[PDB]
């Protein structure tokens, strides 16, 4: 609150050269499995920041911090600084970009009010999620907890930022990974099947679940348990052929038309995008970069596009080489003539 805290914090991206950082108006805003999250105001600039505090084992490196020190993207909450603090024990503190809203909260307001999120926002929010994934997947980093709670929004600018890398991991082919991750509703089928050799494509399934959820006003796959979740998917997508099961798993509903799950007025390209994300076969799913280049997002590339409030859209085309690395020719679609 009124107390001024001064710490010696290390720049998130820069050289390892610690600075004194003073912050104030400190309040907890989240306290869960993720740790404790604080809102605070930087003394010098008057800028709000979030501070994530997690217990550290000290005999071990923090994975989340390793990942965050690598990332610099407009659709990912930035690590401004990190520092350590003591109790008695030892905590690591991530000083992060503050973002006021979440997709969860926003979808819930619309749902509660019996309304749907306007399609322009669905395009904006989904696109920026895919850019963020294209970016992190380019390092072989899989978020592994893509869900509406982890999508932060600035409603005034329509900026979406991916947050919570506490479940993120660099996926190395041949190194086994845990299957019971992601939030249930958003959890890929291969995970429910127990695959330990999964790829970044689990994030893409999750994004599809988010997109489907923004279109419907409720989770598309609301599993009752970790096991009932597979049933919920089958109910919507129909039984996987044995070929698909082989694709998902290292060891009786039919095809349910995609244009009937959603409401009658849902844009067909949104349904078409959805169908390419929610494929049983992990490698059949679009890459995030491919998802960005999908027709559903064409309006975002229209030179006349504006937010509902008249403002320009936020950064949409400032693609780096790193972001483009999975399919560089896609730059021809992604970056429209006027943006060059
Ligand atoms: C406020 O909503 C939450 C969302 C996710 C989490 C999980 S851990 C985390 N990692 N970065 C964050 C983070 C970064 C910037 C933020 C933020 C949270 O809230 C406002 O600006 O939170 C905790 C939360 F409390």
CSV table of C-alpha atoms and ligand atoms in Angstrom, one decimal:
chain,number,residue,atom,x,y,z
A,1,UNK,CA,0.0,0.0,0.0
A,2,UNK,CA,1.8,3.1,1.3
A,3,UNK,CA,5.1,1.2,2.1
A,4,UNK,CA,7.8,1.6,-0.5
A,5,UNK,CA,9.7,-1.6,-1.3
A,6,UNK,CA,13.2,-1.3,-2.7
A,7,UNK,CA,14.9,-4.4,-4.1
A,8,UNK,CA,17.9,-5.3,-6.2
A,9,UNK,CA,16.3,-6.8,-9.2
A,10,UNK,CA,17.9,-8.2,-12.4
A,11,UNK,CA,16.6,-7.0,-15.8
A,12,UNK,CA,14.5,-9.7,-17.5
A,13,UNK,CA,16.1,-9.6,-20.9
A,14,UNK,CA,19.2,-7.4,-20.5
A,15,UNK,CA,22.7,-8.3,-19.4
A,16,UNK,CA,22.8,-9.7,-15.8
A,17,UNK,CA,23.3,-6.3,-14.2
A,18,UNK,CA,21.0,-5.7,-11.2
A,19,UNK,CA,19.3,-2.4,-10.4
A,20,UNK,CA,17.5,-0.9,-7.5
A,21,UNK,CA,13.8,-1.0,-8.2
A,22,UNK,CA,11.3,0.7,-5.9
A,23,UNK,CA,7.7,-0.2,-6.0
A,24,UNK,CA,4.5,0.8,-4.1
A,25,UNK,CA,0.7,0.3,-3.8
A,26,UNK,CA,1.4,-3.4,-3.3
A,27,UNK,CA,-1.7,-5.6,-3.1
A,28,UNK,CA,-2.2,-9.3,-3.7
A,29,UNK,CA,-4.4,-10.0,-6.8
A,30,UNK,CA,-4.1,-13.7,-7.0
A,31,UNK,CA,-3.1,-16.5,-4.5
A,32,UNK,CA,-3.3,-20.0,-5.9
A,33,UNK,CA,-1.4,-23.0,-7.3
A,34,UNK,CA,0.5,-20.5,-9.4
A,35,UNK,CA,1.8,-18.8,-6.3
A,36,UNK,CA,1.1,-15.3,-5.1
A,37,UNK,CA,0.5,-12.5,-7.6
A,38,UNK,CA,0.7,-8.9,-6.6
A,39,UNK,CA,-0.2,-5.6,-8.3
A,40,UNK,CA,2.2,-2.8,-7.6
A,41,UNK,CA,3.2,0.6,-9.0
A,42,UNK,CA,6.8,1.5,-10.0
A,43,UNK,CA,8.0,4.5,-8.0
A,44,UNK,CA,9.9,6.2,-10.9
A,45,UNK,CA,7.5,5.9,-13.8
A,46,UNK,CA,4.2,5.4,-12.1
A,47,UNK,CA,3.7,2.2,-14.2
A,48,UNK,CA,1.7,-0.7,-12.8
A,49,UNK,CA,3.3,-4.1,-12.7
A,50,UNK,CA,2.3,-7.6,-11.5
A,51,UNK,CA,4.7,-9.5,-9.3
A,52,UNK,CA,4.6,-13.2,-9.2
A,53,UNK,CA,6.2,-14.8,-6.2
A,54,UNK,CA,7.0,-18.5,-6.1
A,55,UNK,CA,8.9,-20.6,-3.6
A,56,UNK,CA,12.4,-21.7,-5.0
A,57,UNK,CA,14.4,-24.8,-4.1
A,58,UNK,CA,17.7,-23.0,-4.7
A,59,UNK,CA,19.5,-26.3,-5.3
A,60,UNK,CA,17.6,-26.2,-8.6
A,61,UNK,CA,17.1,-23.7,-11.4
A,62,UNK,CA,13.6,-22.2,-12.0
A,63,UNK,CA,12.3,-23.4,-15.4
A,64,UNK,CA,9.7,-20.6,-15.6
A,65,UNK,CA,12.5,-18.0,-15.2
A,66,UNK,CA,14.7,-19.7,-17.8
A,67,UNK,CA,11.8,-19.5,-20.3
A,68,UNK,CA,10.8,-16.0,-19.5
A,69,UNK,CA,14.4,-14.6,-19.7
A,70,UNK,CA,14.2,-15.8,-23.4
A,71,UNK,CA,11.0,-14.1,-24.4
A,72,UNK,CA,10.3,-10.7,-25.9
A,73,UNK,CA,7.0,-10.5,-27.8
A,74,UNK,CA,4.0,-8.1,-27.8
A,75,UNK,CA,1.6,-10.9,-27.1
A,76,UNK,CA,3.4,-12.3,-24.1
A,77,UNK,CA,3.5,-10.7,-20.6
A,78,UNK,CA,7.1,-9.3,-20.4
A,79,UNK,CA,9.5,-10.2,-17.6
A,80,UNK,CA,10.7,-6.7,-16.7
A,81,UNK,CA,12.8,-7.8,-13.7
A,82,UNK,CA,13.4,-10.7,-11.3
A,83,UNK,CA,14.6,-10.8,-7.7
A,84,UNK,CA,14.8,-13.0,-4.7
A,85,UNK,CA,13.3,-12.4,-1.2
A,86,UNK,CA,13.4,-14.3,2.1
A,87,UNK,CA,10.9,-15.5,4.7
A,88,UNK,CA,11.8,-17.6,7.7
A,89,UNK,CA,12.2,-19.4,3.1
A,90,UNK,CA,13.5,-18.4,-0.4
A,91,UNK,CA,11.2,-16.9,-3.1
A,92,UNK,CA,11.7,-15.9,-6.7
A,93,UNK,CA,9.8,-12.8,-7.7
A,94,UNK,CA,8.9,-12.1,-11.3
A,95,UNK,CA,8.1,-8.4,-12.0
A,96,UNK,CA,5.8,-8.5,-15.0
A,97,UNK,CA,3.8,-6.3,-17.4
A,98,UNK,CA,0.5,-5.5,-15.7
A,99,UNK,CA,-2.6,-6.3,-17.8
A,100,UNK,CA,-6.1,-5.4,-16.4
A,101,UNK,CA,-8.5,-8.0,-17.8
A,102,UNK,CA,-8.8,-11.7,-18.8
A,103,UNK,CA,-10.5,-13.5,-21.7
A,104,UNK,CA,-12.2,-15.7,-19.0
A,105,UNK,CA,-13.7,-12.6,-17.3
A,106,UNK,CA,-14.7,-11.1,-20.6
A,107,UNK,CA,-16.3,-14.2,-22.0
A,108,UNK,CA,-18.1,-14.7,-18.6
A,109,UNK,CA,-19.6,-11.1,-18.7
A,110,UNK,CA,-21.0,-11.8,-22.2
A,111,UNK,CA,-22.3,-15.2,-21.2
A,112,UNK,CA,-23.9,-14.0,-17.9
A,113,UNK,CA,-25.5,-11.2,-20.0
A,114,UNK,CA,-26.7,-13.7,-22.6
A,115,UNK,CA,-24.6,-12.1,-25.3
A,116,UNK,CA,-21.7,-13.2,-27.5
A,117,UNK,CA,-18.3,-11.6,-27.9
A,118,UNK,CA,-18.4,-9.6,-31.1
A,119,UNK,CA,-16.6,-11.5,-33.9
A,120,UNK,CA,-14.0,-8.7,-34.4
A,121,UNK,CA,-12.7,-9.3,-30.8
A,122,UNK,CA,-12.8,-13.1,-31.4
A,123,UNK,CA,-10.5,-12.4,-34.4
A,124,UNK,CA,-8.3,-10.0,-32.5
A,125,UNK,CA,-7.9,-12.1,-29.4
A,126,UNK,CA,-7.4,-15.4,-31.2
A,127,UNK,CA,-4.9,-14.0,-33.7
A,128,UNK,CA,-2.7,-12.6,-31.0
A,129,UNK,CA,-2.8,-15.9,-29.1
A,130,UNK,CA,-1.6,-17.7,-32.2
A,131,UNK,CA,1.2,-15.2,-32.7
A,132,UNK,CA,2.3,-15.7,-29.1
A,133,UNK,CA,2.2,-19.5,-29.7
A,134,UNK,CA,4.1,-19.3,-33.1
A,135,UNK,CA,6.7,-17.3,-31.1
A,136,UNK,CA,7.1,-19.7,-28.2
A,137,UNK,CA,6.8,-22.8,-30.3
A,138,UNK,CA,9.7,-21.4,-32.4
A,139,UNK,CA,12.0,-22.1,-29.3
A,140,UNK,CA,10.4,-25.5,-28.8
A,141,UNK,CA,8.7,-24.1,-25.8
A,142,UNK,CA,5.2,-25.4,-25.1
A,143,UNK,CA,3.0,-23.3,-22.8
A,144,UNK,CA,0.9,-26.4,-21.7
A,145,UNK,CA,-1.7,-24.3,-19.9
A,146,UNK,CA,-3.6,-22.4,-22.6
A,147,UNK,CA,-6.9,-21.5,-21.2
A,148,UNK,CA,-9.0,-18.3,-21.0
A,149,UNK,CA,-7.7,-17.4,-17.5
A,150,UNK,CA,-4.2,-17.2,-18.9
A,151,UNK,CA,-5.1,-14.8,-21.7
A,152,UNK,CA,-4.8,-11.2,-20.4
A,153,UNK,CA,-6.6,-8.3,-22.1
A,154,UNK,CA,-6.3,-4.6,-22.3
A,155,UNK,CA,-9.9,-3.8,-23.4
A,156,UNK,CA,-9.0,-0.3,-24.5
A,157,UNK,CA,-6.3,-1.4,-27.0
A,158,UNK,CA,-7.5,-4.9,-27.7
A,159,UNK,CA,-4.1,-6.2,-26.8
A,160,UNK,CA,-4.0,-9.8,-25.7
A,161,UNK,CA,-1.0,-11.1,-23.7
A,162,UNK,CA,-0.2,-14.7,-22.9
A,163,UNK,CA,0.7,-15.2,-19.2
A,164,UNK,CA,1.6,-18.0,-16.7
A,165,UNK,CA,4.6,-19.9,-17.9
A,166,UNK,CA,4.7,-22.0,-14.7
A,167,UNK,CA,3.7,-25.1,-16.7
A,168,UNK,CA,5.8,-24.3,-19.8
A,169,UNK,CA,8.6,-26.5,-20.9
A,170,UNK,CA,11.0,-26.8,-23.8
A,171,UNK,CA,9.9,-30.0,-25.5
A,172,UNK,CA,12.9,-32.1,-26.6
A,173,UNK,CA,12.1,-34.9,-29.0
A,174,UNK,CA,12.9,-38.2,-27.2
A,175,UNK,CA,12.5,-36.7,-23.7
A,176,UNK,CA,9.3,-37.9,-22.1
A,177,UNK,CA,6.8,-35.4,-20.6
A,178,UNK,CA,3.9,-35.6,-18.1
A,179,UNK,CA,0.4,-36.3,-19.6
A,180,UNK,CA,-1.8,-34.8,-16.9
A,181,UNK,CA,-1.3,-31.1,-17.6
A,182,UNK,CA,-3.4,-28.2,-19.1
A,183,UNK,CA,-6.8,-27.4,-17.6
A,184,UNK,CA,-9.2,-30.2,-18.2
A,185,UNK,CA,-11.7,-28.6,-20.7
A,186,UNK,CA,-8.8,-27.4,-22.8
A,187,UNK,CA,-6.7,-30.6,-22.6
A,188,UNK,CA,-5.7,-32.3,-25.8
A,189,UNK,CA,-7.0,-35.9,-26.5
A,190,UNK,CA,-3.4,-37.4,-26.7
A,191,UNK,CA,-2.9,-36.2,-23.1
A,192,UNK,CA,-6.1,-37.8,-21.8
A,193,UNK,CA,-4.7,-41.0,-23.6
A,194,UNK,CA,-1.4,-40.7,-21.6
A,195,UNK,CA,1.1,-39.7,-24.4
A,196,UNK,CA,4.4,-38.6,-22.9
A,197,UNK,CA,5.9,-37.9,-26.4
A,198,UNK,CA,3.5,-35.1,-27.3
A,199,UNK,CA,4.5,-31.9,-29.1
A,200,UNK,CA,3.6,-28.2,-29.1
A,201,UNK,CA,0.4,-29.1,-30.9
A,202,UNK,CA,-1.3,-29.6,-27.5
A,203,UNK,CA,-1.3,-25.8,-27.2
A,204,UNK,CA,-3.0,-25.6,-30.6
A,205,UNK,CA,-5.8,-27.9,-29.4
A,206,UNK,CA,-6.2,-25.6,-26.4
A,207,UNK,CA,-6.4,-22.5,-28.5
A,208,UNK,CA,-9.1,-24.3,-30.6
A,209,UNK,CA,-11.0,-24.9,-27.3
A,210,UNK,CA,-10.7,-21.3,-26.5
A,211,UNK,CA,-11.9,-20.2,-29.9
A,212,UNK,CA,-14.8,-22.6,-29.8
A,213,UNK,CA,-15.7,-21.3,-26.3
A,214,UNK,CA,-15.7,-17.6,-27.5
A,215,UNK,CA,-18.1,-18.6,-30.3
A,216,UNK,CA,-20.5,-20.7,-28.2
A,217,UNK,CA,-20.5,-18.8,-24.9
A,218,UNK,CA,-19.5,-21.8,-22.9
A,219,UNK,CA,-16.8,-24.5,-22.9
A,220,UNK,CA,-17.1,-26.8,-25.9
A,221,UNK,CA,-15.8,-29.8,-24.0
A,222,UNK,CA,-16.9,-29.5,-20.4
A,223,UNK,CA,-15.7,-32.8,-19.0
A,224,UNK,CA,-17.0,-34.0,-15.6
A,225,UNK,CA,-13.7,-35.6,-14.7
A,226,UNK,CA,-10.3,-36.3,-16.3
A,227,UNK,CA,-11.9,-39.4,-17.8
A,228,UNK,CA,-15.3,-38.0,-18.8
A,229,UNK,CA,-13.4,-35.3,-20.8
A,230,UNK,CA,-12.6,-37.8,-23.6
A,231,UNK,CA,-16.4,-38.6,-23.7
A,232,UNK,CA,-17.2,-34.9,-24.0
A,233,UNK,CA,-14.9,-34.6,-27.0
A,234,UNK,CA,-16.2,-37.8,-28.7
A,235,UNK,CA,-19.8,-36.4,-28.2
A,236,UNK,CA,-18.8,-33.4,-30.4
A,237,UNK,CA,-16.3,-34.8,-32.8
A,238,UNK,CA,-17.3,-38.4,-33.1
A,239,UNK,CA,-15.2,-41.5,-32.3
A,240,UNK,CA,-11.6,-41.3,-33.6
A,241,UNK,CA,-10.7,-43.8,-36.3
A,242,UNK,CA,-8.1,-46.4,-35.3
A,243,UNK,CA,-5.6,-44.4,-37.4
A,244,UNK,CA,-6.3,-41.3,-35.3
A,245,UNK,CA,-6.0,-43.3,-32.0
A,246,UNK,CA,-2.6,-44.6,-33.2
A,247,UNK,CA,-1.6,-41.0,-33.8
A,248,UNK,CA,-2.6,-39.9,-30.3
A,249,UNK,CA,-1.6,-42.9,-28.3
A,250,UNK,CA,1.6,-44.9,-28.0
A,251,UNK,CA,-0.6,-47.9,-27.1
A,252,UNK,CA,-19.6,-45.0,-31.0
A,253,UNK,CA,-20.7,-41.6,-32.3
A,254,UNK,CA,-20.0,-40.8,-36.0
A,255,UNK,CA,-19.0,-37.6,-37.8
A,256,UNK,CA,-21.1,-34.8,-36.3
A,257,UNK,CA,-21.4,-31.9,-38.8
A,258,UNK,CA,-19.3,-28.9,-37.7
A,259,UNK,CA,-22.0,-26.4,-38.8
A,260,UNK,CA,-24.4,-27.7,-36.2
A,261,UNK,CA,-22.3,-27.5,-33.0
A,262,UNK,CA,-22.2,-23.7,-33.2
A,263,UNK,CA,-25.0,-21.2,-33.5
A,264,UNK,CA,-26.6,-20.6,-36.9
A,265,UNK,CA,-25.0,-17.2,-37.5
A,266,UNK,CA,-21.4,-18.1,-36.6
A,267,UNK,CA,-19.1,-17.1,-39.4
A,268,UNK,CA,-18.2,-20.1,-41.6
A,269,UNK,CA,-14.5,-19.3,-41.6
A,270,UNK,CA,-14.5,-19.4,-37.8
A,271,UNK,CA,-16.0,-22.8,-37.9
A,272,UNK,CA,-13.5,-23.8,-40.6
A,273,UNK,CA,-10.6,-22.6,-38.5
A,274,UNK,CA,-12.0,-24.4,-35.5
A,275,UNK,CA,-12.2,-27.7,-37.4
A,276,UNK,CA,-8.5,-27.4,-38.3
A,277,UNK,CA,-7.5,-26.8,-34.6
A,278,UNK,CA,-9.6,-29.5,-33.0
A,279,UNK,CA,-8.3,-32.5,-35.0
A,280,UNK,CA,-7.6,-35.8,-33.2
A,281,UNK,CA,-4.3,-36.2,-35.1
A,282,UNK,CA,-1.8,-33.8,-33.5
A,283,UNK,CA,0.1,-33.3,-36.7
A,284,UNK,CA,-3.1,-32.6,-38.6
A,285,UNK,CA,-3.7,-29.4,-36.7
A,286,UNK,CA,-2.6,-26.1,-38.1
A,287,UNK,CA,0.6,-24.6,-36.8
A,288,UNK,CA,0.0,-21.4,-34.9
A,289,UNK,CA,1.6,-19.5,-37.7
A,290,UNK,CA,-0.7,-21.3,-40.2
A,291,UNK,CA,-3.6,-20.4,-37.9
A,292,UNK,CA,-2.5,-16.7,-38.2
A,293,UNK,CA,-2.7,-16.9,-42.0
A,294,UNK,CA,-6.2,-18.4,-42.0
A,295,UNK,CA,-9.0,-16.6,-43.8
A,296,UNK,CA,-10.9,-16.1,-40.5
A,297,UNK,CA,-8.3,-13.3,-39.8
A,298,UNK,CA,-8.4,-11.6,-43.2
A,299,UNK,CA,-10.3,-8.6,-41.8
A,300,UNK,CA,-7.4,-8.0,-39.5
A,301,UNK,CA,-5.3,-7.5,-42.7
A,302,UNK,CA,-7.8,-5.1,-44.3
A,303,UNK,CA,-6.2,-1.7,-44.5
A,304,UNK,CA,-9.4,0.0,-43.2
A,305,UNK,CA,-9.8,-2.2,-40.1
A,306,UNK,CA,-10.4,-0.4,-36.8
A,307,UNK,CA,-11.4,-1.2,-33.2
A,308,UNK,CA,-15.1,-0.5,-32.3
A,309,UNK,CA,-13.8,2.7,-30.6
A,310,UNK,CA,-12.2,4.1,-33.8
A,311,UNK,CA,-8.6,3.4,-32.6
A,312,UNK,CA,-6.1,1.6,-34.8
A,313,UNK,CA,-5.7,-2.1,-34.1
A,314,UNK,CA,-2.7,-3.0,-31.9
A,315,UNK,CA,0.5,-4.4,-33.4
A,316,UNK,CA,-0.4,-7.3,-35.7
A,317,UNK,CA,2.3,-7.4,-38.3
A,318,UNK,CA,5.6,-6.7,-36.6
A,319,UNK,CA,6.8,-10.3,-37.1
A,320,UNK,CA,10.4,-11.1,-36.4
A,321,UNK,CA,12.5,-13.7,-38.1
A,322,UNK,CA,12.2,-15.9,-35.0
A,323,UNK,CA,8.4,-15.8,-35.1
A,324,UNK,CA,8.4,-16.6,-38.8
A,325,UNK,CA,10.9,-19.4,-38.6
A,326,UNK,CA,8.5,-22.4,-39.0
A,327,UNK,CA,7.2,-21.1,-42.3
A,328,UNK,CA,9.0,-17.9,-43.5
A,329,UNK,CA,7.1,-17.7,-46.9
A,330,UNK,CA,3.9,-17.2,-44.8
A,331,UNK,CA,5.2,-13.6,-44.4
A,332,UNK,CA,3.6,-12.9,-47.8
A,333,UNK,CA,0.2,-13.6,-46.3
A,334,UNK,CA,0.7,-12.4,-42.8
A,335,UNK,CA,2.2,-9.0,-43.6
A,336,UNK,CA,-0.1,-7.2,-46.0
A,337,UNK,CA,1.3,-4.7,-48.7
A,338,UNK,CA,0.2,-1.7,-46.7
A,339,UNK,CA,2.0,-2.9,-43.5
A,340,UNK,CA,5.4,-3.2,-45.3
B,1,LIG,C1,-4.7,-11.7,-12.6
B,1,LIG,O1,-4.9,-13.0,-13.2
B,1,LIG,C2,-4.0,-14.1,-13.1
B,1,LIG,C3,-3.7,-14.8,-14.2
B,1,LIG,C4,-2.8,-15.9,-14.1
B,1,LIG,C5,-2.1,-16.2,-12.9
B,1,LIG,C6,-1.1,-17.4,-12.9
B,1,LIG,S1,0.6,-17.0,-12.7
B,1,LIG,C7,1.0,-15.6,-13.5
B,1,LIG,N1,2.0,-15.4,-14.3
B,1,LIG,N2,1.9,-14.1,-14.8
B,1,LIG,C8,0.9,-13.6,-14.3
B,1,LIG,C9,0.3,-12.2,-14.5
B,1,LIG,C10,1.0,-11.2,-15.3
B,1,LIG,C11,0.6,-10.0,-15.5
B,1,LIG,C12,-0.6,-9.6,-14.9
B,1,LIG,C13,-1.4,-10.6,-14.1
B,1,LIG,C14,-0.9,-11.9,-13.9
B,1,LIG,O2,-2.5,-10.0,-13.7
B,1,LIG,C15,-2.6,-8.7,-14.2
B,1,LIG,O3,-1.4,-8.5,-14.9
B,1,LIG,O4,0.1,-14.4,-13.4
B,1,LIG,C16,-2.4,-15.5,-11.8
B,1,LIG,C17,-3.3,-14.4,-11.8
B,1,LIG,F1,-3.5,-13.7,-10.7
